[PDB]
Design a protein around this ligand. Structure first.
Ligand SMILES: CCCCCCCCCCCCCCCCCC(=O)OC[C@H](CO[C@@H]1O[C@H](CO[C@H]2O[C@H](CO)[C@H](O)[C@H](O)[C@H]2O)[C@H](O)[C@H](O)[C@H]1O)OC(=O)CCCCCCCCCCCCCCCCC
Ligand code: CLA
Ligand code: CLA
Ligand SMILES: CCCCCCCCCCCCCCCCCC(=O)OC[C@H](CO[C@@H]1O[C@H](CO)[C@H](O)[C@H](O)[C@H]1O)OC(=O)CCCCCCCCCCCCCCCCC
Ligand SMILES: CCCCCCCCCCCCCCCCCC(=O)OC[C@H](CO[C@@H]1O[C@H](CO)[C@H](O)[C@H](O)[C@H]1O)OC(=O)CCCCCCCCCCCCCCCCC
Ligand SMILES: CCCCCCCCCCCCCCCC(=O)OC[C@H](CO[C@@H]1O[C@H](CS(=O)(=O)O)[C@@H](O)[C@H](O)[C@H]1O)OC(=O)CCCCCCCCCCCCCCC
Ligand SMILES: CCCCCCCCCCCCCCCC(=O)OC[C@H](COP(=O)(O)OC[C@@H](O)CO)OC(=O)CCCCCCCCCCCCCCC
Ligand SMILES: CCCCCCCCCCCCCCCC(=O)OC[C@H](COP(=O)(O)OC[C@@H](O)CO)OC(=O)CCCCCCCCCCCCCCC
Ligand SMILES: CC1=C(/C=C/C(C)=C/C=C/C(C)=C/C=C/C=C(C)/C=C/C=C(C)/C=C/C2=C(C)CCCC2(C)C)C(C)(C)CCC1
Ligand SMILES: CC1=C(/C=C/C(C)=C/C=C/C(C)=C/C=C/C=C(C)/C=C/C=C(C)/C=C/C2=C(C)CCCC2(C)C)C(C)(C)CCC1
Ligand SMILES: CC1=C(/C=C/C(C)=C/C=C/C(C)=C/C=C/C=C(C)/C=C/C=C(C)/C=C/C2=C(C)CCCC2(C)C)C(C)(C)CCC1
Ligand SMILES: CC1=C(/C=C/C(C)=C/C=C/C(C)=C/C=C/C=C(C)/C=C/C=C(C)/C=C/C2=C(C)CCCC2(C)C)C(C)(C)CCC1
Ligand SMILES: [Cl-]
Ligand SMILES: [Cl-]
Ligand SMILES: [Fe+2]
Lengths: 341, 450, 30, 34, 30, 333, 54, 31, 36, 62
């Protein structure tokens, strides 16, 4: 009829790929995040902000390449190409670490476009939208570690760089400054992740193992009609199996796949809440009781009071080359030595 | 027909399983595989001969096969020197030639030769049910292994000699005259506890004991071969076992996985059958060498070796064992079970003799102690020696680390293969290897559990 | 004081494990 | 301690002998079969 | 020297699949 | 009839609720032993010299440790790899000082989980399934045995095994990163890909099946009453789910076969865990991880710094502080 | 000495056996279990060639 | 007919293995 | 190399990689029938 | 005598090239054992003769 009708005819015409009303967001706003990450890992140095030569052009490998965060003096600016820090001078913008703020803040909309594309195909093909609500959890994770954590903590410099050997620096950064280990929200997170990795292997090694009998040869992959009104695995038999070995066992394969949906997103949301609490520097650092008892009684020495005395050894050694904008050079007497280990 | 999917019922990635009822092609597969093994044994040997340098110690070059010939003692002298390369060259070239013959036989049976030998050859033919014939083939294999053990016994007893690492004045090639074949001693090691101090058969120390145990195995395997050629299995074993094709593979996989674990724990700990001059120092040997080197250093300056109290009250240099002996200190109190030939002449009734550490230190012992702490087994995957917090100084990984890790992984995978096949063979003999039948279902006859 | 709270919570978790294993509803047929 | 050690060896060897003479006692026929 | 080893390695490698090429061409049961 | 026949019939019955089998006679009493020692030793264990340097370490709840910091202390290093049972000790006030219940519980728990894997074979064979549950259960068994058995064999002491506690686990992990650099090791990255892919595939399959449930109930009651137990009707339209996935990403990354999908779910995280199980066993024998120290060098010869040259500083900081009272000679950890 | 202990570490004895009193228990359990099994042999399958395999 | 897909994939595999071998050779002693 | 076999030092250094190529040869041989 | 080794060794390597190229082709052709049979016999005989000649000449090389 009118406008917004032929534009709905097309964008919903079917081809090999599927561009849609939010594919019009997803395909342009992403793919430049991929190009910018590849460009920063291949061509672009980090000599000026950090002090680290981290490009393919400067001898680094696939493990040790990273699009690096800007310096601390670029406190919380958005770091546009044009504007008050680069003025459109593209070479100086790439030198000042604007590529990280390009890729992160540009793919934050890529996640939104992808979840809306996932939400739009589920309306096109008339299905229930449970595939959409699961992908909200890695969006929560991405926002929590790349977006909310550098905002309230004096710099984009204190953010995990887009790399492989830089994520490791970020992990040891939390392990030696924040003690992210003792966070109960992180306990929730590892329980969700590792239990989902459990239950995947359980279900996969159960379903095709209590399988029915349809074919002739021992290759049981060739005996499945995709247009089938029967089953392909004996629910009664697997129930009796796991009931007699393990005790409690499922009986409702609605609830089974819903539980597989529910575990890792619960883990990742309950990790995102703790990453927020760490962004505000409400860290799960030392307690009251064992510390006031160990200051009094010398020979106490729990693994707790060894982890604290080890994290101090992390934080006093790595900082003087991790963050040069502090401008501190420790003398060797100040460092935690350990009496000639 | 033969090499088909939809008639044989096996996919392309399960192709070897189409040879379960094909004796000639199965034989060709095995002989081609033996050709591959002999060809690798020739090729890596000649590669190490081409890259070998004699002035440099053998463990500093990253070589694994040349020490296996040097332990037998071709072309070596006293102290672990290397005098020749032509025995190593002969040992390479003979395998490199014999692999061609085995490859030709394997390709001939796997392409032209007949599929079923049971039709025109009532000797070589075999059915997987035929228990007397299976015991026949097992007897022939045991007799060949017995002659293989007696070859080593003859090489020790009569032919040249074997490089002992416990001869005085450094290790030396000697001829075994009296192999200790006491049954109450040799069947001790098979029963001893596999934990520390005691140790399992990795705690073997004497070349006399090694060659005597091989005399035992050479008699025993020949007796077992003569047993199984003329006997059949008895009914307590004819009902206990699953008699099929894949089951015979299932037993051998678990056996060879145990073989791999024992080889790993041999090659990491032992210094008798894997001598320190050829493979390098071991785990406890590195720490013992370091403590002995710093003690010999600090003794000749003025500080006492006995009354030198350490940081926490315990001895900095010498302290005690849990069982009362006198040993080194630091962290080699976990490694006080070490017994090496550079240390045992300095070791008395209570352990480390203080008088011998004052008066009886040997210069070759000083040299071995000075080089072992330098070439301690601290590798990396990118071949950078030392700890992970070490700069790119020395291109060194010990061969003991490679042997131990490689054989531990290759034994663990054979263990997983045994857990595969021992399940699948009994399931196929039972008759539900392909799935639960929809009509006759074993669960819906049973009681509920509530 | 708090050690009894710790022990009570662990024993209560194990008790709920016990009742979940043995006193479940029977998974019944058609 | 020896009074304990005889008891530990007794329990261990009882369970191991029960294991071995269980698996010798006609195992691969106690299935649903054919 | 690398310049001879590369050509020798190309010969040793190309000895492999040209067997399959000749057998697929001339009418073999590959 | 006979006593042995009736006993074998009872022990290979399938009508008793928790199945036993013939591996169960080692699975059940040995794990009950390990549990009954662990509950006592988590609560009332006296302090243990973990270091052999005459410094006892508190690990139990009664001596000022909560649930997170409570741990069973491993055996002292002077005890080494020596087998140290109760009867070789002098008293029970001497067996608990030198790391006793760790030595007991670990050697019990390993046999327990191996016989549990055998039991998972045995009940599948008794019911008439196909027997490959134990193959999948071989992965966490390997992951347990690598940290409890293989790594203390490699290091020569039972000290460096993993302490049985929450706050002790991390003190194992961080010192392991210090001495062996586990992150720069390609097996460990394969295992990280294993666990993350396992979470992804579990959430993805549980999304794409729950998004296609055939309606059998109303919109007021539960959506889980639509599956009556023991039926023969496929409750999820797998054709529509595969069509949705093919529209979503790819039509040549199809996995249209449900059985191929389940093989992929069974083989992604298991093979993921196997490579870390080998990686721990390789780092046990001091086959260290990667090392990129001083790689990026300018044209003069001076040393530049990278993320590897920051992780080197962090590992130096961990290494010069772990085991603070023992190390005197400058290396060999 | 000061106290009393078995001193069984590092010895290298078969099956960890110290007393013959300790040694008889192995056979005293093994033989009785074998005898119970050999009595229970009555109610099993014994056969000429009725073999349980493919 | 045409050049078959297996003969295409063999040559793609060799042209991948050569580039990866050059990647290891530039990994060892080059920067 | 000990003696006059010295000019074969190039083709010695190609030998141990050769046994690995049999797996790839089997994959190419089963791709020759287009996996059937 | 060195050249007497090296010509025989190059001949041995080239005969081995001829074997690795042709002998699987002759085996896998459906009438190749009927057609090329004496050629395979003469090739194997020549291969064995070259191996024994190199082995004898390595004694005379001093
Ligand atoms: C990009 C690709 C992405 C990754 C995809 C997956 C990769 C798998 C492909 C196979 C491995 C990569 C091949 C290229 C790497 C390589 O090989 O390169 C390695 C070498 C070539 O590098 C050479 O490596 C040598 C290593 O030094 C050694 O030699 C020195 C003196 O001779 C010292 O003795 C030192 O101790 C010792 O380490 C030297 O450093 C040389 O200078 C250097 O040129 O090739 C060799 O060795 C050949 C390899 C030996 C066979 C491997 C089996 C060995 C057994 C271990 C496996 C057990 C199970 C796993 C546990 C681990
Ligand atoms: C080293 C391991 C090995 C071995 C020995 C074999 C051996 C065999 N496989 Mg096999 N296979 C393997 C690995 C192996 N495979 C792997 C890894 C896979 C998975 C991809 C398969 C998948 C597979 C399938 C799917 C099938 C087989 C079959 C067979 C058998 C017949 C082969 C045939 O038709 O020959 C004919 C071969 C050709 C026409 C090609 C020519 C190959 C030539 C001979 C190579 C020789 C090169 C060498 C340099 C020659 C040296 C000569 C010497 C004098 C110097 C044969 C016994 C088939 C079977 O069961 O037979 C009925 C079958 O259906 N296999
Ligand atoms: C050493 C003895 C041995 C022997 C004789 C066999 C023999 C057999 N196995 Mg088997 N297996 C073994 C060990 C052994 N296996 C071990 C140790 C494992 C554990 C991993 C397995 C796991 C296993 C499974 C899971 C299955 C078999 C199957 C089979 C049958 C057909 C195999 C086939 O055609 O595959 C063809 C071969 C391939 C497709 C090879 C693929 C290559 C693999 C996946 C990776 C190679 C890694 C390699 C080292 C990497 C090198 C570097 C690389 C860059 C090139 C056959 C009877 C199958 C069957 O149907 O049994 C009835 C089956 O389902 N086996
Ligand atoms: C269309 C396909 C697009 C695929 C995107 C490829 C992105 C990787 C680029 C590789 C690169 O540029 O580095 C290529 C670099 C280049 O090589 C480097 O060159 C330098 C020159 O001075 C130095 O020599 C370095 O030492 C050397 O490593 O090498 C590597 O980093 C390792 C090789 C890369 C291959 C490893 C696997 C890649 C990861 C695959 C992950 C798949 C699973 C994804 C899960 C989500
Ligand atoms: C089939 C089994 C195949 C096993 C393959 C792998 C073998 C690994 C090594 C095993 C060592 C076997 C020798 C026995 C050692 C021994 O008994 O020493 C004796 C030791 C301990 O004995 C101690 O030894 C010391 C000597 O210095 C002291 O004397 C102590 O007083 C004494 O208690 O016993 C054990 O620790 C082993 C017991 C474990 C047995 C449980 C097996 C359960 C499954 C059995 C299945 C049937 C078999
Ligand atoms: C001094 C040391 C003190 C140590 C104390 C030990 C405490 C632990 C003991 C376990 C108590 C709980 C289980 C008992 C109930 C039970 O038997 O099930 C009830 C059923 C009913 O059986 C039926 O039982 C009938 C017998 S009866 O009449 O019902 O009694 C029988 O006739 C019938 O055939 C059969 O169907 O029993 C069975 O299915 C098998 C019996 C054995 C299974 C129980 C042991 C398994 C426990 C798991 C151990 C691992 C746990 C690790 C730690 C967390
Ligand atoms: C042989 C001995 C070996 C096994 C002994 C140990 C058995 C463990 C039993 C687990 C009890 C958990 C019961 C869940 C509650 C329960 O009864 O679930 C019951 C549920 C039954 O499913 P249904 O099909 O009947 O549900 C139908 C629908 O209407 C509602 O789901 O079974 C499961 O989903 C299995 C999930 C097990 C998840 C177990 C994870 C628990 C982790 C441990 C938590 C405690 C921490 C311990 C630290 C102190
Ligand atoms: C340091 C040295 C270490 C040596 C370790 C030795 C390990 C021994 C392992 C033996 C495995 C036996 C396998 C089962 C053997 C088996 O299959 O049993 C079955 C077999 C008889 O089978 P049949 O049922 O077919 O008998 C024929 C008729 O019964 C047919 O109806 O009996 C024997 O042959 C026993 C052989 C001697 C077994 C040892 C003697 C047992 C009695 C000794 C105990 C003395 C009692 C004293 C009381 C206080
Ligand atoms: C910067 C910038 C931009 C953007 C641009 C673009 C758009 C770019 C793109 C770019 C791109 C487009 C990139 C890509 C990259 C990638 C690559 C370069 C690849 C590589 C790969 C490889 C090398 C391979 C690997 C592998 C596979 C997977 C297969 C097998 C084998 C292997 C494993 C090896 C703009 C102006 C707007 C703005 C401003 C800034
Ligand atoms: C059938 C089949 C198969 C398998 C195959 C095989 C494994 C075969 C065997 C192979 C082999 C493995 C063979 C071998 C060969 C060898 C040879 C042919 C040799 C020659 C000699 C030489 C080369 C030497 C030279 C020289 C001298 C004289 C000395 C010094 C050094 C030199 C170098 C100078 C496949 C996979 C395909 C699949 C399909 C089926
Ligand atoms: C030269 C040598 C020696 C010696 C050696 C020998 C003489 C060895 C032998 C060894 C032996 C003599 C071993 C044994 C083996 C056997 C076994 C390890 C058995 C196992 C068990 C089984 C196989 C069974 C299973 C089951 C049951 C439990 C019952 C029924 C049947 C069935 C299958 C179910 C010495 C010392 C001088 C040292 C150095 C080296
Ligand atoms: C003794 C001697 C001889 C002989 C040698 C030989 C035995 C050779 C053979 C070799 C070989 C035997 C080679 C092979 C090659 C092949 C390859 C290199 C392949 C490539 C391709 C690829 C790598 C791809 C694959 C694929 C497909 C397409 C299917 C599926 C799967 C895949 C994707 C993987 C001569 C005188 C000459 C020299 C001297 C020494
Ligand atoms: Cl610590
Ligand atoms: Cl030290
Ligand atoms: Fe699934």
């Amino acid at each position: 009829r009118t406008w917004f009708d032929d534009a709905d005819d097309w964008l919903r015409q079917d081809r090999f790929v599927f561009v849609g009303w939010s594919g019009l967001l997803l395909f342009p706003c992403a793919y430049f995040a991929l190009g910018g990450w590849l460009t920063g890992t291949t061509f672009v140095t980090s000599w000026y902000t950090h002090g680290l030569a981290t490009s393919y052009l400067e001898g680094c490998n696939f493990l040790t390449a990273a699009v690096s965060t800007p310096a601390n003096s670029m406190a919380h600016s958005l770091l546009f190409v044009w504007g008050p820090e680069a003025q459109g001078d593209f070479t100086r913008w790439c030198q000042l670490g604007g590529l990280w703020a390009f890729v992160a803040l540009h793919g934050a909309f890529g996640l939104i476009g992808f979840m809306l594309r996932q939400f739009e195909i589920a309306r096109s093909v008339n299905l229930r939208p449970y595939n959409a609500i699961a992908f909200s959890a890695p969006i929560a994770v991405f926002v929590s570690v790349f977006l909310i954590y550098p905002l309230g903590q004096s710099g984009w410099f204190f953010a995990p760089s887009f790399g492989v050997a830089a994520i490791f620096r970020f992990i040891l950064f939390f392990q030696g400054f924040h003690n992210w280990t003792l966070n109960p929200f992180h306990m929730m997170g590892v329980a969700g992740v590792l239990g989902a990795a459990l239950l995947c292997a359980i279900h996969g090694a159960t379903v095709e193992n209590t399988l029915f009998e349809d074919g002739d040869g021992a290759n049981t992959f060739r005996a499945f009609n995709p247009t089938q009104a029967e089953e392909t695995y004996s629910m009664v038999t697997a129930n009796r199996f796991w009931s007699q070995i393990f005790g409690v066992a499922f009986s409702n394969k609605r609830w089974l796949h819903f539980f597989m949906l529910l575990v890792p997103v619960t883990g990742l949301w309950m990790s995102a809440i703790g990453v927020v609490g760490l962004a505000l520097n409400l860290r799960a650092y030392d307690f009251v009781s064992q510390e006031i008892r160990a200051a009094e009684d010398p020979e106490f020495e729990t693994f707790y009071t060894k982890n604290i005395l080890l994290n101090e050894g992390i934080r006093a050694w790595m900082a003087a080359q991790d963050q040069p904008h502090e401008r501190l050079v420790f003398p060797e007497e100040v460092l935690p030595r350990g009496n000639a280990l | 027909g033969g090499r088909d999917q939809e008639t044989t019922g096996f996919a392309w990635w399960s192709g070897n399983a189409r040879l379960i009822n094909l004796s000639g092609k199965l034989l060709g597969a095995h002989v081609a595989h033996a050709g591959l093994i002999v060809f690798w044994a020739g090729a890596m040997n000649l590669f190490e001969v081409s890259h070998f340098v004699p002035e440099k110690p053998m463990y500093e070059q990253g070589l694994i096969l040349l020490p296996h010939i040097a332990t037998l003692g071709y072309g070596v002298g006293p102290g672990g020197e290397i005098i020749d390369t032509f025995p190593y060259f002969v040992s390479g070239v003979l395998h490199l030639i014999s692999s061609a013959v085995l490859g030709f036989g394997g390709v001939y049976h796997s392409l032209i030769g007949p599929e079923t030998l049971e039709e025109s050859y009532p000797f070589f033919g075999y059915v997987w049910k035929d228990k007397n014939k299976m015991t026949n083939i097992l007897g022939y294999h045991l007799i060949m292994l017995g002659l293989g053990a007696w070859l080593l016994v003859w090489k020790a007893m009569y032919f040249g000699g074997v490089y002992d690492t416990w001869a005085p004045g450094g290790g030396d090639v000697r001829v075994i005259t009296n192999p200790t074949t006491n049954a109450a001693v040799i069947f001790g090691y098979l029963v001893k506890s596999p934990f520390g101090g005691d140790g399992w058969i990795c705690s073997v120390d004497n070349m006399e004991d090694i060659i005597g145990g091989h005399i035992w195995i050479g008699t025993l395997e020949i007796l077992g071969g003569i047993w199984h050629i003329y006997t059949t299995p008895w009914p307590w074993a004819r009902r206990a076992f699953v008699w099929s094709g894949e089951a015979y593979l299932s037993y051998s996989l678990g056996a060879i996985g145990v073989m791999g674990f024992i080889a790993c724990c041999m090659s990491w700990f032992n210094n008798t059958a894997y001598p320190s001059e050829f493979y390098g120092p071991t785990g406890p040997e590195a720490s013992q060498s370091q403590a002995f080197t710093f003690l010999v250093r600090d003794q000749r300056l003025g500080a006492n070796v006995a009354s030198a109290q350490g940081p926490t009250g315990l001895g900095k240099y010498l302290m005690r064992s849990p069982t009362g002996e006198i040993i080194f200190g630091g962290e080699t109190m976990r490694f006080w079970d070490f017994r090496g030939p550079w240390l045992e002449p300095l070791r008395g009734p209570n352990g480390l003799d203080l008088n011998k550490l004052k008066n009886d230190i040997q210069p070759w012992q000083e040299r071995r102690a000075a080089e072992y702490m330098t070439h301690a087994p601290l590798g990396s995957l990118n071949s950078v020696g030392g700890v992970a917090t070490e700069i790119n100084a020395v291109n060194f990984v010990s061969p003991r680390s490679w042997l131990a890790c490689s054989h531990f992984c290759l034994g663990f995978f054979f263990f997983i293969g045994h857990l595969w096949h021992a399940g699948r063979a009994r399931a196929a003999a039972a008759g539900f290897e392909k799935g639960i039948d929809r009509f006759d279902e074993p669960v819906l006859s049973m009681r509920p559990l509530d | 004081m708090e050690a009894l709270v710790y022990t009570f919570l662990l024993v209560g978790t194990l008790g709920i494990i016990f009742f979940s294993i043995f006193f479940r509803d029977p998974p019944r047929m058609i | 301690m020896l009074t304990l050690k005889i008891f530990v060896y007794t329990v261990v060897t009882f369970f191991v002998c029960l294991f071995i003479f269980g698996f010798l006692s006609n195992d691969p026929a106690r299935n649903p079969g054919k | 020297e690398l310049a001879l080893t590369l050509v020798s390695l190309v010969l040793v490698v190309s000895a492999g699949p040209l067997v399959v090429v000749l057998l697929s061409a001339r009418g073999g049961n590959l | 009839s006979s006593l042995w026949a009736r006993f074998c019939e009872w022990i290979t019955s399938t009508e008793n609720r928790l199945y036993i089998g013939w591996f169960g006679v080692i699975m059940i009493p040995c794990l009950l032993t390990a549990t009954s020692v662990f509950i006592i030793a988590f609560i009332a264990a006296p302090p243990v010299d973990i270091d052999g340097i005459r410094e006892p370490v508190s690990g139990s709840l009664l001596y000022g440790n909560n649930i997170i910091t409570g741990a069973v202390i491993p055996t002292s290093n002077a005890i080494g790899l020596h087998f140290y049972p109760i009867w070789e000790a002098a008293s029970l006030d001497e067996w608990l000082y030198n790391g006793g219940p760790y030595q007991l519980i670990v050697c019990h728990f390993l046999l327990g989980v191996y016989c549990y894997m055998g039991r998972e074979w045995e009940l599948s064979f008794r019911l008439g399934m196909r027997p490959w549950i134990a193959v999948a259960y071989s992965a966490p068994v390997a992951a347990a045995s690598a940290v409890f058995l293989v790594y203390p064999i490699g290091q020569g002491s039972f000290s460096d095994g993993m302490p049985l506690g929450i706050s002790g686990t991390f003190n194992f992990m961080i010192v392991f990163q210090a001495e062996h650099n586990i992150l720069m090791h390609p097996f460990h990255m394969l295992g990280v890909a294993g666990v993350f892919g396992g979470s992804l595939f579990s959430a993805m399959h549980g999304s794409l099946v729950t998004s296609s449930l055939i309606r059998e109930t109303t919109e007021n009651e539960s959506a889980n009453e639509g599956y009556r137990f023991g039926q023969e009707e496929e409750t999820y339209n797998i054709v529509a789910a595969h069509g949705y996935f093919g529209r979503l990403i790819f039509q040549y990354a199809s996995f249209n076969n449900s059985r191929s999908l389940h093989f992929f779910l069974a083989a992604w995280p298991v093979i993921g865990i196997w490579f870390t199980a080998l990686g721990l066993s390789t780092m046990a024998f001091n086959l260290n991880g990667f090392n990129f120290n001083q790689s990026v060098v300018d044209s003069q010869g001076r040393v530049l710094n990278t993320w590897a040259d920051i992780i080197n500083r962090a590992n130096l900081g961990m290494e010069v502080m772990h085991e603070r009272n023992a190390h005197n000679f400058p290396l060999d950890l | 000495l000061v106290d009393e202990r078995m001193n069984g570490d590092g010895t290298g004895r078969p099956f960890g056996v110290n007393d013959p009193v300790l040694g008889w228990v192995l056979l005293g359990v093994f033989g009785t279990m074998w005898a119970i099994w050999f009595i229970g042999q009555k109610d099993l399958g014994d056969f000429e060639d009725a073999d349980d395999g493919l | 007919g045409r050049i078959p897909l297996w003969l295409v994939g063999t040559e793609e595999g060799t042209l991948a293995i050569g580039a990866i071998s050059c990647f290891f050779y530039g990994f060892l002693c080059w920067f | 190399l000990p003696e006059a076999y010295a000019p074969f030092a190039p083709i010695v250094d190609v030998l141990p990689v050769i046994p690995v190529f049999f797996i790839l040869l089997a994959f190419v041989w089963q791709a020759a029938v287009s996996f059937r | 005598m060195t050249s007497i080794l090296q010509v025989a060794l190059l001949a041995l390597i080239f005969v081995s090239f001829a074997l690795v190229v042709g002998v699987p082709v002759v085996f896998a052709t459906p009438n190749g054992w009927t057609d090329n049979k004496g050629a395979v016999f003469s090739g194997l005989s020549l291969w064995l003769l070259l191996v024994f000649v190199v082995g004898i000449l390595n004694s005379f090389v001093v």
